[PDB]
Swiss-Prot record, chains A, B:
Residues modified to Phosphoserine: 113
Modified residues (N6-succinyllysine): 100, 242
This protein's name: Isocitrate dehydrogenase [NADP]
The family this protein is said to belong to: Belongs to the isocitrate and isopropylmalate dehydrogenases family.
Mechanisms controlling activity: Inhibition of this enzyme by phosphorylation regulates the branch point between the Krebs cycle and the glyoxylate bypass, which is an alternate route that accumulates carbon for biosynthesis when acetate is the sole carbon source for growth.
Residues with PTM N6-acetyllysine: 142
Biological processes, Gene Ontology terms: electron transport chain; glyoxylate cycle; response to oxidative stress; tricarboxylic acid cycle
Cofactor: Mg(2+); Mn(2+)
GO molecular function: guanosine tetraphosphate binding; isocitrate dehydrogenase (NADP+) activity; magnesium ion binding; NAD binding
Length: 416, 416
């Protein structure tokens, strides 16, 4: 019905032309609080960003936060069963740059993921997750400092599309019949009481993702792009991802064979560095990141694999309490921590706000406000090195001081 | 045509009745050499097993090895394009207990996996992979000793079924048309130039796997069974796996709520221990194994997830050079390392034979030859503690002696 969103009177809208953002001194930034621990981490992110912006520009610049709604809080604002109001999608696109806390997705039934809904409806086809080591962060591995990677996760297709039917349903039986009788499929071991999902992977979806990964490698003078896939078992989806990725590198970036292949080199047109384009089968890759972390840099992979890789890598540098991300499309960008709503901690002021804070760091950098972004990095490193940290770091360390979520936010500010 | 397999004159066939193996003193055991590094690890496994058997039983018992064929070597024995002769399947079933080196599966085209073909054709629906720490093994993690888990990976369905069509093929277009027009599917982002795979998960496939996992937990007095799944995003496949797994625990093993759930406890009828039945979402699980390894024990998961988990966990305890496995069905069992053919090392006598050797350890234990199995464990621990090890361990250690694959086999024997 009537919108409950309040456009800030003091703010102005970020604009986009020529693919370049025009960010005013007083930009309006929509944010979603998030379900569960969103109630803890979001207020910490708001105060930390505001402090970094104030310290960097001395009042010349200020973000006008505009709360928008999705998830539990939306049902309370807009009414029962309003989980994702249309205006939320419209406002994120209109305002160009936004940030969200995590959203709860029920298992085995219930609503489809609102996080996926946002990514899909806004065509935010890049899930960008940098994973790097902050000095002083406790880690289960001996050399966390060797992990410095950037995940480019395809964000619009794969088994994530949400195409599936429940076992014993008329639809599942309908699909199973089609597959067996019309497609001559014989490899369904138990066609009765059988759930069915569909996994699509397209040339266009692949290439736009890999193109972004390669451009990022060029823009940031990175060393390599590794295509991760399970293309021996899934030849026509994951295997195609690998083939299209290599093809894209050759056709658009001049990739050439390294010593007869199969890897390619792409010459960085800005620095002259030869960027290696390579690939690793996904299961083997989960060992490679632990046993040979220094050999990997930019990672390009499909939706599901990227999901797994995000948590696995984050764990090497302290866990998903320190794992930022962004969902990026051609028209807008929605910043977002890797982690979920961790309901068991929700409202305890306990979890690590580092992830959403570092997602705001990416947002600020995205906005060209690099000085403010630098202060967040500085404050984060300062607080961790001072061993004043949240429970997830404290349990992996001797002699640390346990801080609440809110207190760790203050610690970051104190270290700016 | 004419079989090229030679049945050993001195051996006798293992038999099965009442689900119990009757293993003669002179059992015939089929083995497949394997492609690639199979040429290195298989001869080491043969000599190590023979030594353990000789030392344990002083000539009273002896394995009559019978080479059978699949993969590259089969094409050379039986002719071009004979990759998996029917007799190989027949002989594994007939002889009840067999062991294989790894087999090469091409990426993005070429033959479908022979490893999967064997598992599927023989209905070896359990992929059983124990992951534990051998003292003295180098590791990227600080506390590898906290990892002591057993993977039960569903081995007959999931996206592994091999049901998929190539982008732009008549069949893919046919399936895409069916999905869009007859099933009203709207979530395929790019329906053109689009590969398509099918992911089936059934009640029966799930329950037989989880039943085995729970029985193993009972038989070995383990602490918990964790169901790993991505059931928030794949509600009707992975989410169903989780639901059926819990249901099975309740209906067949008397599982009861722990403090109002969602976890269950299953009382061990032999020891009285309460076995915890729980679940973790798959991405989060890849952090859990690193940050809270001691909280996990028996793992039950679907085909693909188990594939990933096998390598990720193995890496915590030295990598897939020390990662054994078994494919187990109701009628026979085929032992097999977790690792592949690593073609870049093939024939260099370089890789770690530990994995296939420890798979033979499982085979021996499976045969009730526990004394021989114990000697393999002892020799393995002895060689590693002596820091005489293959390249994969040597690079993670200071002051080790680098051994060839064959030499490490001798080192194991020397330490029996
Ligand atoms: N993009 C998103 O909004 C998003 C992402 C992932 C999951 N989810 C949703 O969240 C719900 C719960 O999923 P889940 O429990 O598997 O994942 P989760 O909410 O990320 O929690 C998994 C574990 O990760 C650790 N963790 C998560 N956030 C943390 C933080 N801020 N600081 C420190 N540690 C943190 C905790 O580990 P320990 O308890 O071991 O210390 C937590 O129990 C699901 O409905 C899922 O759909 C949403
Ligand atoms: N069940 C099977 O038969 C099986 C299983 C997996 C893969 N494969 C097949 O094998 C082929 C190659 O796949 P891939 O290269 O991704 O996997 P891979 O053959 O397992 O090799 C991956 C990496 O794992 C390490 N590794 C593997 N075996 C080892 C050993 N015995 N000792 C020490 N380290 C070892 C090596 O790591 P580093 O080089 O980093 O030291 C190797 O490069 C594919 O065709 C695949 O289909 C078969
Ligand atoms: Ca995730
Ligand atoms: Ca594997």
């Amino acid at each position: 019905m009537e919108s409950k969103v309040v456009v800030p009177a003091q703010g102005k809208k970020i604009t986009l032309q020529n693919g370049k953002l025009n960010v005013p001194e007083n930009p309006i930034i929509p944010y979603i609080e998030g379900d569960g621990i969103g109630v803890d981490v979001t207020p910490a992110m708001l105060k930390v960003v505001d402090a970094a912006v104030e310290k960097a520009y001395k009042g010349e610049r200020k973000i006008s936060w505009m709360e928008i709604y999705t998830g539990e809080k939306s049902t309370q604002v807009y009414g029962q069963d309003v989980w994702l109001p249309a205006e939320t999608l419209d406002l994120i696109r209109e305002y160009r740059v936004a940030i969200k806390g995590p959203l709860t997705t029920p298992v085995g039934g219930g609503i489809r993921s609102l996080n996926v809904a946002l990514r899909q409806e806004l065509d935010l086809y890049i899930c960008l997750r940098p994973v790097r080591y902050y000095q002083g962060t406790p880690s289960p591995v001996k050399h966390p400092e060797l992990t410095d990677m950037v995940i480019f996760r395809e964000n619009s297709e794969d088994i994530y599309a949400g195409i599936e039917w429940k076992a014993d349903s008329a639809d599942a039986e309908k699909v199973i019949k089609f597959l067996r009788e019309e497609m001559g499929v014989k490899k369904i071991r138990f066609p009765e009481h059988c759930g069915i999902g569909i996994k699509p992977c397209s040339e266009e979806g692949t290439k736009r993702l890999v193109r972004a990964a390669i451009e990022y490698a060029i823009a940031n003078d990175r060393d390599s792009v590794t295509l991760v896939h399970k293309g021996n078992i899934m030849k026509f989806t994951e295997g195609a991802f690998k083939d299209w990725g290599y093809q894209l590198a050759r056709e658009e970036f001049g990739g050439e064979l390294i010593d007869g292949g199969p890897w390619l080199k792409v010459k960085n047109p800005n620095t002259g560095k030869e960027i290696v384009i390579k690939d690793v089968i996904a299961d083997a890759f989960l060992q490679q990141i632990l046993l040979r972390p220094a050999e990997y840099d930019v990672i390009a992979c499909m939706n599901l694999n990227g999901d797994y890789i995000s948590d696995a890598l984050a764990a090497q540098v302290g866990g998903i309490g320190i794992a930022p991300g962004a969902n990026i499309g051609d028209e807008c960008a929605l910043f977002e921590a890797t982690h979920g709503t961790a309901p068991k901690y929700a409202g305890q002021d306990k979890v690590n706000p580092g992830s959403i804070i570092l997602s705001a760091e990416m947002m600020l950098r995205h906005m060209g406000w690099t000085e403010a972004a630098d202060l967040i990095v500085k404050g984060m490193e300062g607080a961790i090195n001072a061993k004043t940290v949240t429970y997830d770091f404290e349990r992996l360390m001797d002699g640390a001081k346990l801080l609440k979520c809110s207190e760790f936010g203050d610690a970051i500010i104190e270290n700016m």
